[PDB]
Amino acid sequence: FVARPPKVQVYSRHPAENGKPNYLNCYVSGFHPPQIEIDLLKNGEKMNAEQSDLSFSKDWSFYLLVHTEFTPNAVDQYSCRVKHVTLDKPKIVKWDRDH
């Protein structure tokens, strides 16, 4: 019955250049139960992304990687929205090429 909130990190695979093909990652971890909604957002609208196969750490908490292709520029905004039983409301983390 002990539910554990998710941790979220939004980042790119490579240091972002404007106009350069890259990969946008959303790493969700430390959560339980496994049921969870993870969306990568572009300007607030949902991107088509793929999600890793469910796995967990030594402490039984699950982690997931949601990722997709994207090309950063000086105009487009990206973020990751996460819904979980432990969250009153969706948890949104903006993407920042510096963090």
Binding site: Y27, S55, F56
Partner: protein, 275 residues
């Protein structure tokens, strides 16, 4: 340090669909190499890396066949423990399994393990002696008694000491060019404006493997752990890992600080600076 072969099972009862979803992933060290999901009709044990593909049809047939029977046993498992805990059939529950073997410097089993969890808490586990079990609570003891009576232990011991280390060795050789060659972190220190104006130094460690790494900050040797920000190590998406550490510094004294990086892919600790 030592290499390891590990398997992770996650079974989830779906009280809405009437059965359970079984997901199983395999790992050699920090590399996932196989996976199984029964959610799709005609599920197979699938490869995740190039080197595991050189396996024969028989290998996949027999892994699939094995994990299939296993998924079923975990479905019955969820229903059994549901009873042990007197739980309604209205909610969903999770049964997790975690087992593997750590190959020592000799190339022999150094560490064997097998643990189960119900709804994210320890249920039952095999002891380091691979001969006895530890039950977390009263319900788990019902299984412990059943498993002792069945001599379940000697079967886990034999797999851990045999097939598990033999497979692992076979895998380490098959994926020698990736599993055994270390990938040192690419590093650099960026400089960004921050609050109160406000300068923050950030030390990046990118595209490294294995996962284990150490990033520290030093002004004159004094550790700066207390007031520094370190993020969890995260996957890059290509099989390698990322991580950074940051700390606010006085504009004008940036080079007083050095970033210290340690990784098994580096011959010696790396000293890093804003340049």
């Amino acid at each position: 340090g030592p290499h390891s072969l590990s398997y992770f099972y996650t079974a989830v009862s779906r009280p809405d669909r009437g059965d359970s979803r079984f997901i199983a992933v395999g790992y050699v060290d920090d590399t996932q190499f196989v996976r199984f999901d029964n959610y799709a009709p005609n599920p197979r044990m699938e490869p995740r890396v190039p080197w595991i593909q050189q396996e024969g049809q028989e290998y996949w047939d027999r892994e699939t066949r094995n994990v299939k029977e296993t998924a079923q046993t975990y479905g019955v498992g969820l229903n059994t423990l549901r009873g042990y805990y007197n739980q309604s059939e209205a909610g969903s529950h999770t049964l997790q399994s975690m087992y593997g073997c750590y190959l020592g410097p000799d190339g022999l089993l150094l560490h064997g393990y097998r643990q189960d969890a119900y709804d994210g808490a320890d249920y039952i586990a095999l002891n380091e002696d691979l001969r006895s079990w530890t039950a977390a609570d009263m319900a788990a003891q019902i299984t412990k008694r059943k498993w002792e009576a069945a001599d379940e232990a000697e079967r886990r011991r034999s797999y851990l000491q045999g097939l598990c280390v033999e497979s692992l060795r076979r895998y380490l050789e098959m994926g020698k060019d990736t599993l055994q060659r270390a990938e040192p972190p690419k590093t650099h220190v960026t400089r960004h404006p921050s609050s109160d104006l406000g300068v923050t130094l950030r030390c990046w460690a990118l595209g490294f493997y294995p996962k284990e790494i150490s990033l520290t900050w030093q002004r004159e040797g004094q550790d700066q752990s207390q007031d520094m920000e370190l993020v969890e190590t995260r996957p890059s998406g290509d099989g390698t890992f990322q991580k950074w550490a940051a700390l606010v510094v006085p504009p004008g004294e940036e080079q007083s600080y050095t970033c210290h990086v340690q990784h098994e892919g580096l011959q010696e600790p790396l000293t890093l600076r804003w340049d």
